Design a protein around this nucleic acid. Structure first.
Ligand code: CA
Ligand code: CA
Ligand code: CA
Length: 292
DNA sequence: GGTCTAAACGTCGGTTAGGAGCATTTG
DNA sequence: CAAATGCTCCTAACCGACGTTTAGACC
């Protein structure tokens, strides 16, 4: 089965990266090598996801060593990328990065990066891209003025598949077992849906809650979480939503086991010892407890 | 009070993100 | 020759995922 473009975009909002490498090359006229990259790096166990992406865009190089990566570094591949994200725009702060990247791309495509002016401009672009300029690049290009970075605000959810890809990237379906003496079975069993993101896009997360009509915002001791713990919201909103909008990767399997446990909780089997052992058995093989 | 649900509060460790540069091809 | 791209190696935090305690409904 083929993947949705908005799923690709959501997942990219989650896990992808737009990069500019500027490295001193003595074998070049400007004395510098400038190259744009787009990349997605995952755990090996999710190679298939990358393949799916590769199948949709018809571009990208997939490798697998200590991790699995799909990369786009040549001009043509990057054209494919830019086409996709122009048709299907990111909505997190990463979009900003994309724009910078995009600008840089066109400077390199038109070869004016081989000009010192072009080089300097590209350095202003990298200055505001992700982690910005290293100390080495800072001293190599003194007092470069960081390009204006677009603050991504008022981002409406473009598509439900975007949500699917995004939680496929940052989401978490897990079962919480709490040591509670008030429970005659000895433990409280909770089904929990979660999405984690840096505070920079808290607005989006809030706008996401309204989209799912459930969830609470949690601020950590930094990061922000969309947390769904209400069983009825889970059974009536979340589960149907992700049954319609599929989760890719191993997290799909995790989500299935999660679903099974939710059904066990709905039938109040979590209130008995037998059902508790059952649920625990399912949980031990979920997420961090899964194998090859 | 007894019980259970929802969720606020807490915390670990690694899969993500982000990085830089040599090697090879293209020309 | 030089410019583009292929390929490989390095770094660590924003994530994922796990745990306990608190407010409070029904009975
Ligand atoms: Ca992310
Ligand atoms: Ca992930
Ligand atoms: Ca992630």
């Amino acid at each position: 089965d083929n993947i949705s473009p908005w799923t690709i975009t959501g997942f990219a909002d989650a896990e992808s990266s737009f990069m500019l490498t500027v490295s001193k090359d003595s074998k070049r006229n400007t004395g510098w090598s400038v190259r744009p990259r787009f990349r997605i790096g995952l755990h090996n166990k999710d190679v298939t996801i990358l393949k799916s992406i590769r199948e949709y865009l018809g571009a990208g190089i997939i490798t697998s060593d200590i991790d699995a990566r799909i990369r786009f570094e040549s001009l043509k591949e990057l054209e494919v990328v830019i086409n996709h994200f122009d048709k299907y725009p990111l909505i997190t702060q990463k979009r900003a990065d994309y724009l910078l990247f995009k600008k840089a791309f066109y400077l390199i495509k038109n070869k004016e990066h081989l000009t010192e002016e072009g080089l300097n401009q590209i350095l202003t672009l990298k200055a505001s891209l992700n982690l910005g300029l290293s100390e080495e690049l800072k001293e190599a290009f003194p007092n470069t003025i960081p390009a204006e970075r677009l603050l991504v605000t008022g981002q409406e959810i473009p598509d439900s598949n975007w949500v699917a890809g995004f939680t496929a990237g940052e989401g978490s379906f897990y079962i919480r077992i709490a040591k509670n003496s008030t429970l005659k079975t000895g433990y409280q069993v909770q089904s929990v849906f979660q999405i984690t993101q840096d505070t920079r896009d808290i607005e989006l997360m809030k706008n996401l809650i309204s989209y799912l009509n459930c969830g609470n915002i949690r601020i950590r001791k930094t990061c922000v979480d969309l947390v769904v713990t209400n069983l009825n919201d889970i059974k009536e909103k979340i589960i149907p939503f992700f049954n319609k909008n599929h989760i890719i990767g191993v997290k799909l399997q995790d989500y299935r086991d999660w679903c099974k446990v939710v059904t066990l909780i709905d039938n109040k089997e979590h209130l008995t010892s037998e059902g508790l052992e059952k649920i625990q058995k399912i949980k031990e093989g979920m997420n961090r407890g899964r194998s090859l």
